[PDB]
Structures are given as structure tokens and as C-alpha cells.
Design an enzyme around this catalytic site. Structure first.
Site, PDB file in Angstrom:
ATOM      1  N   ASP A   1       0.807  -1.217   0.000  1.00  0.00           N
ATOM      2  CA  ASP A   1       0.000   0.000   0.000  1.00  0.00           C
ATOM      3  C   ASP A   1       0.844   1.274   0.000  1.00  0.00           C
ATOM      4  O   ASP A   1       0.322   2.339  -0.333  1.00  0.00           O
ATOM      5  CB  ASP A   1      -0.846   0.025   1.269  1.00  0.00           C
ATOM      6  CG  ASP A   1      -1.999  -0.972   1.234  1.00  0.00           C
ATOM      7  OD1 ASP A   1      -2.413  -1.429   2.346  1.00  0.00           O
ATOM      8  OD2 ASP A   1      -2.540  -1.270   0.123  1.00  0.00           O
TER       9      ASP A   1
HETATM   10  O1  LIG Z   1      -4.868   2.094   4.755  1.00  0.00           O
HETATM   11  C1  LIG Z   1      -4.166   0.962   5.288  1.00  0.00           C
HETATM   12  C2  LIG Z   1      -2.671   1.087   5.070  1.00  0.00           C
HETATM   13  O2  LIG Z   1      -2.232   2.296   5.644  1.00  0.00           O
HETATM   14  C3  LIG Z   1      -0.848   2.620   5.379  1.00  0.00           C
HETATM   15  O3  LIG Z   1      -0.459   3.858   5.994  1.00  0.00           O
HETATM   16  C4  LIG Z   1       0.048   1.524   5.998  1.00  0.00           C
HETATM   17  O4  LIG Z   1       1.429   1.828   5.740  1.00  0.00           O
HETATM   18  C5  LIG Z   1      -0.377   0.174   5.440  1.00  0.00           C
HETATM   19  O5  LIG Z   1       0.357  -0.921   6.011  1.00  0.00           O
HETATM   20  C6  LIG Z   1      -1.851  -0.069   5.713  1.00  0.00           C
HETATM   21  O6  LIG Z   1      -2.238  -1.193   4.919  1.00  0.00           O
HETATM   22  K   LIG Z   2      -0.910  -4.239   2.168  1.00  0.00           K
END
Ligand SMILES: OC[C@H]1O[C@@H](O)[C@H](O)[C@@H](O)[C@@H]1O
Ligand SMILES: [K+]
Ligand SMILES: OC[C@H]1O[C@@H](O)[C@H](O)[C@@H](O)[C@@H]1O
Ligand SMILES: [K+]
Lengths: 822, 822
Positions: A490
Site C-alpha cells: 500500500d
Molecule cells: O490504509 C491501510 C494502510 O495504511 C498505510 O499507511 C500503511 O502503511 C499500510 O500498512 C496499511 O495497509
Molecule cells: K498491504
């Protein structure tokens, strides 16, 4: 360094002190009603959806952590204490918390009064039941008054926490001291208006007194540890109007030496039909019928114990599908109990609500719930089938999908972003796993709408075609899938270029254009597009299947031609067409995800584990050397030390945490599985042990979080906190480790037409037996394993040699005895 | 019953106990940097925007309330206490808190050590400064260690409170024990990435030790009242890595008998240009230049004192524009000090951030900022001018407007709903008040965009024509303005019909069609449409003006014909054309808003206060009889006791609270001004007293909240909590009561071409003098007032009788002596 121990015969983790490095929780419930319960009784409960129907209030980042939960204040002669230790923190003579499957017991003893509380959510009930047993362990009579306490939440947790300007004036309750089985308090905020639901908090005795106003019970200027009413020794019989509703009852008990008394408390969620909401014509008094019935079902200790036993039997039945008996008790407790229990929890909660995820912005993830299906389909296949239908209903006609849906409504939303290009392929993964498991080919015919639109229904198979075609029709200049907002990672946001502070990279508008490509989705497409090709051929779609094999072959060749850096797979091409994850750059030289996924997809696999020229081997050796730590494998190396605008969120984490150099555990099983594919069982098992709860229990002071479940992130080697976990419980790590250990290391794994038996675990597990129920027959799989690298199994079945490693599925009711020699 | 008292000479409210009914706060800062500070040092600070740039963390709904803020733990001989009382709650020998204009002082003394802290935001600075004086009040030498403490917020307050799964890994600090003026801690979360800003917490001495990690300073299992570090008596010198950054320094102090030592602490907000963010080539070390400079500006007591004196002179200058000397000291302190000070706070804060508004969802309200201008234009007209341009720039081309804007960016959003059809006319109100005050006719020529769009600029006047034409072109079948989502009453949602729980009524989608009309907006149109006509006339737009006064007449006639129930004005017609606010209904028979506003607009006014045939008088008598309570006038009567689906949010409050039978104080001044219009000064003044802080101080135990500022809501007669306030400080009540008292009761009110002098206050204030600076001249206005009912003023000016009650504006520098006989 340990704060407890496993008890395998009881299927429990036993915490023998309140003084853990962090609150350690269990989840109660497996159906529609859930409770987060710490070893100090902290946490909260909700019905279906932690944002929208939260019954009870919990403060994240409280000082101290976890002050707030279901408390039982004991006043023995003026001395007030709580057996959960928090919030009062009185010295206890004895303390133990046992977290079991769907229940926990917490027991505290002080000055000759022992108070044990069994907490659970019963099967079939939307309620958390507490059976409290008070025992006089002294040699003289005791009198004590017991005050229960829970703080209600005003249903909508986001509103509860932010919109006091409205909601300090809406809190409403009813009090029923003289009900049919004892005393009850009703929390009925907004039942006056659009809600058809209320909460009850009741006890199976006529209580001496009650409290429903927090400020009255606790007292001005006081914390929960200093609550006035228990210190006074009597209830204030407070009736709330707005401010902070609570449920509290007082019961005075007198016990001779050795005598005990049980009290049964219930927190319940009730609904009434709109036409039957009110007891009275004037619509002022709630219809209590379903709350009275609930309390009747838990009016006796015998009823509690019967329900606790039914829950124990439910868990025995769930865990009977896959079990292992080996010479490694740590391995066995993970496979037989803990990893499967966690996969039920991830199935139910996705990434929504834990002691880290706040049960607000996150619902049921499209990628997340698909990954969780991989470790859940053997546990309850009918519920996995339903989940697939619900997830696929949130997909759009072009094959892209909402990234998550709201648990209460099952409707997709963009609240944590849109356009994650790995999402459509995860649906094919989830379905292929489910069909292999169940042989339920008919699910491919289930009508499934797009974006929940009545009349848009097409067979679930056609949803998979939309997924497949989305990747086909979205490839970049190297023939690799366009990455979109991000792939599985992500924080790999190649279309973002954000210079505006505080705008979430997850939701921020992305830039159209550029040529950014993902080597991870390429591998994902080779792996799962092969399964789509298979489903198409099984459906009699010969030409669609031929075409699908061709596109898989194209993308596979593109990984090797344009996705190879020399000693490992590239990670991506950025918006400008420049490589990401190359040794040509100073930081982020190698990224783990395509190394594990490309090799799982067979890409670059040579002649054997000792074939030093095979790209898979080179790639996995580079992972071992550059990413390996005693705590697991870090996501990339070196971590980024300054913000890289063209990469998005990733470089915004300090090195060694989360996506920038953290051990992001969900991607470790990909490398474990990849290691099994190339024939290095010993190394795959090593990586499994480095991140697995039962192996990490002896360093509980380093790990800090629960020693019996996987966590999303362990700080990596570049962190000063190296070894320390965050975000326990809710992670795809649970399903993927279960896949890795059950199907690849132990080697027992469903295929469409038979059960594959292909151990690859190395010499540390030289003998074991798997008992596997599959397609209605039971397979007893006795494995004698030299663990020699590259050595693969030969099988005999029911006394006769069979060719290869796939056992054709036997008819239902069979016992099939498979003898495995590696 | 009081917990303190007013000190008029000092312009302070003196709180003489920590044990108030509720935390009582002050606001520090009047420019771009603001602090919320309770009498227990609780609260937080932010730059420009409480959601997006919040420096320090505060927990709403904490147990106890307000545990958290700017603490100074004193360890004397092993005994630890804080002079703020909370969080430690040690017995103090003496305690006092003084809240002043832009500063507060909190003093606590225990066992021979007195610790006084002055808190303020200096003019021109984005920082909160504390000057701490510690005094040995004993007869023998003393030593102690003082540990400062503040907990940082991760800038974005919403993310801070809900996004732990990311944000527990991003906290970063730097520590500078040996800087130019003393020791400093930097909180620099996300400066690595997109933030060009960091916070500093420093002290003007080389601290013995420091701490930046909350868990280390506080200790596991501990509240702030139990913090480990101060109890041990030595800093742990912790350096945070994620989790919860804090700023804490320890300072050892030694004092002879009677000796004092000053310490100066500074919390500051600093920015660097992008090109100069870093001290080092590797970009790991923040450029400290701007922080070093700030700390040098507050390195000495002398600098602190000079700055506090500059702040005092600023307030004396602001308050020199309007003041009164009367026989009523309660009236005088409100007009002279507190009401004006509150008007400054509402001008700056709108409804965004208080101890009730959480500084997340609410920015700068279009309606709210226009109502606030009515009470602010005489304070700083140049800042009022700019706010007008800001608000008008968020208006759309059709005259409708975003309901509020984000303070950091000045861009409109729909976060708390859209399409409130009273909004457009409030802009006319704001501009008319501004021009009457200042004679700055040239503001009407200022180019102003629609929705900040480059190239869309038209003159501000043309924005007013879009507002005026919006109402003209959106009337329903009776000639009354269509209400849209709601009018001034946010809970009157006639196009809603929501049966879905927990969807905010404010933002939920509305149904097209229907004929829902507002009598409130009709009265607002008659009142402010007339102002718009006068502005058009002054611009020479005779066609535009003539047509404008025609429409004003049509709506006025529509109110009398179709908005009149018999003994009061109707409120509304619902979606299906059924009357709201009619004696024909069992509940919600009379609603206060059109009674006040219609009569303010002259609608239904007859021959005099004793013209019992006049609709205005019948309406006002019905208000007195049906809505009057000792605490003020409730919004409507009877309150609704079941959910009325066709009316939206209103009937969702329990009777007696907020918009369902609460005293919604913003609407009371409309009735006060109405009563002045009809000639009943005695009744207008009575209503003013009922809701006014100085008058309610003697029931501090009933009002509960700050006794020196207005609140939005006092519980009405139908509430078990009748008399108790919520939502103090941030309310249109402040501006509108200033309007009422200064301009209608005391009677001194600017008009376009002269100063109206029209006292209407009744016999309880039989003489007073107003000193009013208007258009550069000072008017000394000496009133002899019989209070005779309906008696209005005759004037002599500079020894000569004048005709009427308007004094033509004198040239700048004049002193005009006006003698008033009523
Ligand atoms: O929205 C969810 C995502 O937020 C991001 O800030 C994190 O780094 C990810 O690990 C998480 O899956
Ligand atoms: K992920
Ligand atoms: O959006 C803010 C609005 O929220 C509603 O719930 C309240 O009843 C109003 O008083 C408030 O103005
Ligand atoms: K309002």
C-alpha cells in the site's frame, strides 16, 4: 523472558502476571457479535461492525494503556480492589488470565477473597456473558459488596469520539431493578429515533443498587482506579440524562470459609421489529421482551456451563479438519490450535478492529478477505462461500473493485483508497483456494451483482473473467501490469507525487499518465491467471482458456526479460519508466515481494536447489543475505533514509518500521513457499520459525505483543527497536503462514482432483503424521522425512504404490492411509 | 454559589479552587496560534487549524476530565506534586488560577514551595510561553527538581486519534541539551517527508536531564498522576522512536528563604523554507535556526514581561472603541471586557475547537463567521474586512455557498452538510454590519472569486446580488423562501425523512422536490434584503434597488398572510405543505426563531408596546408565556417526545436539550432586540440578564461551565438538568448579545451616515455613559433614562437640540458630546 505459557491440553494461553509488556488480548465470538478482551478485562464489544454498532466504549492511547473494560470492584470492609488488577492496581495475592478459544478466564485474589470471571460470547447469541465466582479462601466469614461496571459507547464510534457538541445530550437509559431473572439496565441512545436496537447489561439476581451515570459512579476528579461508588460501599442509584451512560449493579455477598457464590452477568445486543419497538402506546418505554428472554437463557450457572461446553465442542469440530502430530510441540500447537484460531479471527474482523486498528476507517478488505480465505476455506467452507459472494458483489464491471466494504451494509467504499491493481487478482486466488478445498464447482454459477446493483448479476465465473481481463488490458511498456494506486504494498505509490502534508497517501488523488509497472502484480498474474485458465477449461471454454494461457506465458516471459536485475527480481518501473528495486540505486536495492511471489509462480526455477545459475536460487540467496534477520525478513534493503517523492508513502516511515525496512510478516510466507518450490525445505522451515508465535514466546520481552498470534510488523534490523512487533492479530500473515506450514512445509494441499502430498520441511521435522479431512474422506498421512535438500516424496496408498504426489480424492466416508517417504 | 470572582481592574476571572463543576478554560492567542488552557493547565495548542496543525495532544472524554496538559512536577524531598493540582491531586496549601485577556496564571503552593506559572501566546509569535516563578516561602533553604511535561500530537489530530496502525511507527524527535539559550526538544514527526514544520519545547536553562518518550517518563501501568520519572527524582533521558513523543526537562532548583527563581519555557511552531529544512547534507538533522531565534526572544524574564505588557496594551487599545459606565457593575464588566473578549475568540475559532467542539470536523462556518462579524467589526475592522473576502470566496456563482471552510487552506467543504438556505443572506448581514461600522464602501468593489476559482472574480457587491437573488428565485408556493437542508436551525431538516440509523442528519442526502418553506428565512430576507437594497441605492443602482424593495415587500406580505398562526408566527411548511409551529399540532406549537427575527425586521409592529392588536406584540407575549424560564427562552414548546420523521434531527434530542426544547442562546438576543423594537426595554433587559455570564455567576453550581462567557445551550424547562449549560465559548450567542446590549439596550448603533442613539433598556439602568469611537471621532454619550415603557430618546449634541435619534458622523478627531433624554 516469558509472562506465561501455553497449555495445549486446555487450548489456552496462560498469562501469570498482570505486568505484561503490552495489553494482550483475546477475541470472543465467531459469528456476528465480537469482543476484544485484554488480560486485564480491557476492551469493548460490537455487533457486526465496530464503527457502527459499538456497544461499549474503549479509549485507544489511554494513560495508562487499557484502563477501561468490564470491571468488578470488590469492597471488602472498606478495601476496594479489582481482580483484573487494573484499574485499581491493588496488590493481589494471586493473579492469572487464561485466553482460550472463544472465552477467557481472569482470576484475582486479595485478602481471602478470590474472584474468577469466565468471559465468553455464546454460540447463537449477540451477547458477552460473564460468570463470576467469588470464594472465601480465608478461615473466617467474609462480607463484600461487588460492583459491576461497563461504560457504554453511543453506537457510532466515530461520532462517540468526536461529536460531543450533539451527543452529550442524547445518552438515554432505562433501569429495571426488579426484572424477571434479576436486575437490568438498558442503554437506549437514539432508540427514540432511527435505531431499532438497544443494549442490556443485567445480572441474574435482584441487585442491591445500580448506577447508570459515569460521573456519579466514578466521582469528579477521579480515574476508574479511584471510583467513588465502590469506595463508598454502596450504589448511588444514578439515572443518566445525557453525559456518559454506564451499566453497574451492586450485590453484597456473605460467605463462610470455603464457600463460593456464582453471579452471571450479560451484556446483550437486542433488536425489535419497528412495529414492536415500544411497550406502550405513547412510544416512551422500550419493549424489553427480547432482553428478558436473553437474560432467561443465562439465569443459571448450569446454562452458562452448557453454553461454554457447546463452544468447546464447536472448536473441537472446527480443528478436526487439519491436525499434525510431530516431534516438535511448538510446530504442533501452531498448526493444531493457534494459527487456525487466528484465521477464524482474521476471517471475521479483516483489518478492522484490534488494539491497533481502531474499528473506524477499516471495514472488510477486498484483498484482505481474499488472503484470509486462503487460511480459512478448510475451517468452514459454507461461510467462505458466502464471503466470496459478498466480496465479489463489491467489484465493478471493468474488473476493478472497491478496496473494502462496510461490514454492516456489505457495500464498498473508498475510505482507504481506490484503484489498487492487485485487488482484482486476489478474487481469483480466493475462489481457486475455495474450489480446491471443497470441489464446489457450482459456486462459479452463483449470480453475483456488480457494485450490489439489483439486476446486474452475472455468474461468479464472469467476475473472474473481469478480474483477469483487467490485468490483461492494463499492462505497461514492458508487458508488466500497470500498478495503479499501489499493489499489495500500500505504500508503493508511483502515481502520487505528494508534497502536501497530512493528506493520506492512501486516499490522495493520483496523477493520470506515466508508465509505472509492478513486478509483484506480474508474478501474481502468472500464479493466479494460471488458475483462471484452469477454471475456464473446466467450464468448457476452450478458446478463452487457450487465450488465458497465452497471456500468462507473455507476462511470465516479461518478468524474466524486463523484471530481472541480475541477482534478484526488480520491484517495479516508476512513473518515468525507471527501475525500482535495482542494485543501480543506493537504497531500496532489493524488495522482498516479487522474490517470494515470482518464485511461487515458478519463474526462474532451474534444476534443483543446488543449481546456482537459476534466477530463483539467486533471488532467494539475495533475500537471505540482504533481508534476513533473527526476527524475520525485512521488506527492502537498504531502507530509504530521505523522502523519495516518486515512491509515495514508503520512504515516510523511519527506517526499520512498517513498509520501509520493517519485517512485514505477510510477505515472509511467500519466501517460505518459494524456498519449498526450489527444494530448500530446511531454509523455508527456518524462516517459518523466525516469525512464528510458539518459537518467539521465549523472547516475549523483545516481541512485546501477544506470544500466541502473528502480528503485521516486527521492527527490522535498521530500527533501534529491532525485534519489537506492532499491529498484532489482524494480518494476512495468519492465513499465509497457515498456507505455508500446512500445505507446503508439511506438504498437504488440496488440488482440483486430488490431495497433493509434498513435504518440504528439512531435517528438523523428520517424522510426523497429518490427519486431513478433505471432500468427506479422512486421510492419515504418515511421513518419514530425511529432509535432504531437493528430496521430494514418493507415496504408497492403502498398501499400493502410486505414481507421483497427487492422491485422487477418495469417496466420502473413506479412511485413506498414505505412507510418505522423503 | 461561586468558585471564584471577577477582578474588573485586572480584567481577570479569578478561580479560587481546583474543584470547579467542570474544567473552565481560557483561549491564548488572537492571531494565528491558539491555545486552549483550563484552570488545571489542561488542553492543547495549534497553528491556524486545530485539525491539521495541532502541536500537542488532548483527550476529550477522559477519566477524569482534563487529565492532560502542561504539567510541572515538583519533587521536594521525594514528595511529588503539581501546582495545577491535576494530575497528581496533592493537597496544596494555596491554589489560584487567573484567566486574563490572552494570558492566565495558575499558582499552587505546598510545603514551603510556591510555583506560579504565567501562560500566554505573545503577539507576533506562534508559540506558547510559560514564565514559571518558584519561591521558597519557608524559613530554611530548600532544594527541589522540577520536571516539565507536554505530550505531542502528530499534527493531524484525526490521524493522531485513529490511525495507530501507521502512526505508532512515525514519531521522531531530536534532543538538544546544550543549545544557545538552554535545552530544547524538537518534535519533528513527518518533517522527513512533506512537513516543512516542527515543534520545539525548550527552557532558558541547561536542563539536568530530559525525556522524549511518554511510556518511559510515565512508566508502565501509570497515569500521569503517578508518573515514574518525577517520583524517582531523575530524568531517564529517553529518546523516542515512534510510540508517544513528549517534551520534558528536569531542572534542579536551590532557593534561600524567601528567594524566587524564574524559568521560561517555550512551546513553539517553526517552519523552514524547503531549501533550508536541514542542517546536514544527509537530511537527518533539522535546521534549528528559527527555533534558536525564538528561544532567544524569550531567554529572559525581562523579555517575557515586555511581551505580556505589549499584550496588555493591545487589549486596552481593542477595548477603547466601545465602553460603558453605568450603575450596574455586572452589565459594565460584560460590555467592557468579557463579551468583547469572547467576540474575539469566536471570530478566530468559529465553532471549531473548544472543550466541546473537538477541532476535527468543523472549520470556519459561513453562517457562523458572518454572525461573528456582527460582534467583531468594531474591534478590528481590517481583519473583519479580510474575513469577509475569505468567506465570500467560498460562495458559488448561484449565490449558495459552502457551509464552512478549512481554516488552513480557506477552501470550502461539505463535511458538515450543504445547501443551508439561510447561508447566502448571512453574507449580506456581515457586509452591511461592516460598512455601517467602517464607512468602507470600497469593499463592495473588491474582486472576489466564486469557490476560489482563478479568473472567476466579480465585485463583492455582485456576490451580494447572487445571495439576494438566490432567495428571490427559491421561494415556495406561499411566497416564502424554500428551506433546503435546514435554515439557521440545523435540526429542522424538512427534506430528509431518514430511517437509517447513524447517518448524520447534517450530511445525509436529501430528497428532491416537495414544497418545504422557512418562515425564519422569510424574516431574514425582509431584514437583510432591505440592507442589500440600501447598498444598491448607494451604488446608484435604482432599477436594482427598486426591484429589491419590491421583493422585500412581497415576502413581508407573505409572512403576514401565510406565516401567521393567530398568536405567533408559523415556523415552516414541511415537504408536503403542512404547517410547522402551529397551535394546531400537539407538540412544537411555538418556535422562537421567527418570533425574534420577524419582529426585528419590523413585521407585525403596530402603534406601540401596548398595541395589543399588533402581531409583533401577540407573538412576543406568546414567547414570554410559552418559552420563558429563569434561565432563558427555550427554542420551542412543547418539546417533541417521539421521533417526527418529517422534521429531521430536531426530535432526536431528549426534551429540554439542544434544538428540542433547549435554551439555544444564539436565538435569545433576537427576542431581546425584538422587544426593544416594540418598545419594551424592561422585558428586553430581563431576557438579557437571564442568559448573561456576569448575572449567572451566582448560580455557578447550576450553569456548571465558565461563568465569564456565553454557551450555546442551557438545558430548558423540560430537562431534568434544567439550568445546566453545554458547549461554552463557541457560539453566535456572543456576537448577537453584544449586538443586543451595545446597540439596542444601551442603544448606540452605527448606521450608514450617522450614529443612532436609541436606548431601550427599561428603568433598571437609570443613567449611564457610553464612550464610542466611530469613523475616527469619539462620541461621549450621556444617558438619563426613565425607562418609561415605549419612551424613546431625544438628543442634544454639543449644546444644540437635534431632530430624531441619528447623529450625523462628525469628522475624525472630533469629540462629540451627546446628551440623551429617555
Ligand atoms: O490504509 C491501510 C494502510 O495504511 C498505510 O499507511 C500503511 O502503511 C499500510 O500498512 C496499511 O495497509
Ligand atoms: K498491504
Ligand atoms: O453540524 C453541527 C450541528 O450539529 C447538529 O447535530 C447540532 O444539533 C447543531 O447544534 C450543530 O450546529
Ligand atoms: K445553527
Amino acid at each position: 523472558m516469558r509472562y506465561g505459557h501455553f497449555d495445549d491440553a486446555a487450548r489456552e494461553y496462560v498469562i501469570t502476571t498482570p505486568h505484561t509488556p503490552y495489553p494482550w488480548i483475546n477475541y470472543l465470538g465467531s459469528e456476528q457479535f465480537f469482543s476484544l478482551l485484554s488480560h486485564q478485562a480491557g476492551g469493548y464489544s460490537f455487533y457486526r461492525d465496530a464503527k457502527m454498532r459499538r456497544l461499549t466504549r474503549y479509549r485507544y492511547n489511554n494513560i495508562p494503556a487499557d484502563a477501561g473494560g468490564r470491571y468488578l470492584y470488590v469492597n471488602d470492609g472498606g478495601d476496594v480492589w479489582t481482580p483484573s488488577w487494573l484499574p485499581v492496581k491493588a496488590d493481589l495475592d494471586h493473579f492469572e488470565a487464561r485466553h482460550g478459544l472463544g472465552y477467557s478466564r481472569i482470576t484475582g485474589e486479595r485478602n481471602g477473597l478470590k474472584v474468577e470471571t469466565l468471559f465468553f460470547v455464546p454460540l447463537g447469541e449477540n451477547a458477552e456473558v460473564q460468570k463470576v465466582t467469588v470464594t472465601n479462601t480465608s478461615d473466617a466469614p467474609k462480607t463484600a459488596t461487588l460492583f459491576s461496571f461497563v461504560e457504554f459507547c453511543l453506537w457510532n464510534a466515530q461520532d462517540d469520539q468526536t461529536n460531543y457538541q450533539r451527543n452529550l445530550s442524547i445518552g438515554e437509559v432505562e433501569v429495571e431493578q426488579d426484572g424477571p431473572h434479576g436486575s437490568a439496565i438498558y442503554h437506549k441512545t437514539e432508540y427514540r429515533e432511527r435505531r431499532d436496537h438497544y443494549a442490556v447489561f443485567g445480572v441474574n439476581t435482584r441487585a442491591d443498587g445500580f448506577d447508570t451515570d459515569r460521573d456519579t459512579f466514578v466521582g469528579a476528579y477521579n480515574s476508574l482506579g479511584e471510583a467513588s461508588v465502590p469506595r463508598a460501599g454502596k450504589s448511588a442509584d444514578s439515572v443518566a440524562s445525557g453525559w456518559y451512560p454506564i451499566g453497574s449493579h451492586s450485590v453484597a455477598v456473605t460467605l463462610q470459609p470455603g464457600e463460593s457464590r456464582d453471579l452471571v452477568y450479560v451484556l446483550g445486543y437486542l433488536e425489535n421489529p419497528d412495529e414492536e419497538k415500544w411497550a406502550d402506546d405513547a412510544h416512551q418505554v422500550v419493549n424489553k421482551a427480547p432482553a428478558h428472554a436473553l437474560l432467561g437463557r443465562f439465569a443459571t450457572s448450569e446454562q452458562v456451563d452448557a453454553a461454554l461446553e457447546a463452544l468447546n465442542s464447536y472448536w473441537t469440530n472446527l480443528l478436526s479438519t487439519y491436525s499434525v502430530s510431530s516431534t516438535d510441540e511448538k510446530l504442533d500447537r501452531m498448526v493444531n490450535i493457534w494459527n487456525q484460531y487466528q484465521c477464524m479471527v482474521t476471517f471475521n474482523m479483516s483489518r478492522s478492529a484490534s488494539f491497533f486498528e481502531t474499528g473506524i476507517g477499516r471495514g472488510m478488505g477486498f484483498r484482505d478477505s481474499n488472503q484470509d480465505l486462503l487460511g480459512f476455506v478448510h475451517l468452514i467452507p459454507e461461510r467462505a462461500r458466502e464471503r466470496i459472494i459478498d466480496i465479489a458483489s463489491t467489484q465493478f464491471a471493468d474488473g476493478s473493485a472497491y478496496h473494502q466494504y462496510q461490514p454492516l451494509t456489505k457495500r464498498g467504499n473508498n475510505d482507504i483508497g481506490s484503484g489498487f491493481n492487485d485487488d482484482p487478482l486476489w478474487l481469483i486466488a480466493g475462489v481457486a483456494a475455495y474450489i480446491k478445498e471443497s470441489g464446489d464447482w457450482g459456486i462459479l454459477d452463483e449470480p453475483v451483482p456488480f457494485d450490489n446493483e439489483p439486476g446486474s448479476e452475472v455468474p461468479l465465473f464472469e467476475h473472474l473473467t473481469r478480474s483477469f481481463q483487467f490485468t490483461v488490458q492494463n499492462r505497461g511498456p514492458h508487458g508488466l501490469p500497470l500498478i495503479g494506486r499501489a499493489d499489495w504494498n500500500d505504500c508503493l505509490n508511483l502515481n502520487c507525487f505528494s508534497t502536501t502534508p497530512g493528506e493520506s497517501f492512501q486516499t490522495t488523488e493520483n496523477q493520470a499518465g506515466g508508465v509505472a509497472e509492478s513486478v509483484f502484480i506480474a508474478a501474481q498474474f502468472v500464479l493466479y491467471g494460471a488458475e483462471y485458465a484452469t477454471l475456464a477449461e473446466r467450464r468448457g471454454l476452450a478458446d478463452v482458456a487457450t487465450e488465458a494461457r497465452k497471456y500468462v506465458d507473455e507476462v511470465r516471459a516479461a518478468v524474466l526479460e524486463h523484471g530481472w536485475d541480475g541477482q534478484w527480481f526488480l520491484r517495479a518501473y516508476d512513473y518515468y519508466g525507471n527501475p525500482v528495486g535495482t542494485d543501480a540505486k543506493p537504497e531500496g536495492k532489493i524488495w522482498i515481494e516479487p522474490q517470494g511471489f515470482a518464485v511461487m509462480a515458478g519463474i526462474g526455477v532451474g534444476e534443483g536447489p543446488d543449481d546456482a545459475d537459476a534466477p530463483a536460487v539467486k533471488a532467494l540467496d539475495s533475500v537471505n543475505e540482504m533481508l534476513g534477520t533473527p526476527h524475520g525478513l525485512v521488506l527492502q534493503y537498504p531502507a530509504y533514509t530521505t523522502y523519495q517523492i516518486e515512491l509515495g508513502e514508503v520512504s515516510t516511515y523511519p527506517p526499520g518500521y512498517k513498509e520501509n525496512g520493517g519485517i512485514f510478516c505477510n510477505n515472509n510466507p511467500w519466501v517460505i513457499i518459494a524456498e519449498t518450490v526450489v527444494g530448500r525445505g530446511a531454509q523455508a522451515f527456518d524462516y517459518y520459525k523466525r516469525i512464528t508465535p510458539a518459537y518467539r514466546e521465549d523472547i516475549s520481552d523483545t516481541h512485546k505483543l501477544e506470544p500466541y498470534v502473528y502480528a503485521q510488523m516486527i521492527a527490522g534490523k535498521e530500527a533501534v527497536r529491532a525485534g519489537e512487533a506492532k499491529n498484532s492479530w489482524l494480518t494476512g500473515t495468519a492465513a499465509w503462514n497457515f498456507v505455508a506450514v500446512s500445505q507446503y512445509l508439511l506438504g498437504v494441499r488440496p488440488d482440483y482432483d486430488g490431495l497433493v502430498v509434498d513435504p518440504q520441511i528439512g531435517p528438523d521435522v523428520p517424522s510426523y503424521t497429518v490427519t486431513r479431512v478433505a471432500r468427506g474422506a479422512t486421510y492419515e498421512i504418515t511421513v518419514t522425512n530425511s529432509g535432504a535438500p531437493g528430496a521430494r516424496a514418493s507415496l504408497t496408498v492403502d498398501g499400493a504404490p502410486v505414481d507421483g504426489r497427487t492422491v485422487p480424492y477418495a469417496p466420502a466416508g473413506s479412511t485413506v492411509r498414505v505412507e510418505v517417504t522423503v
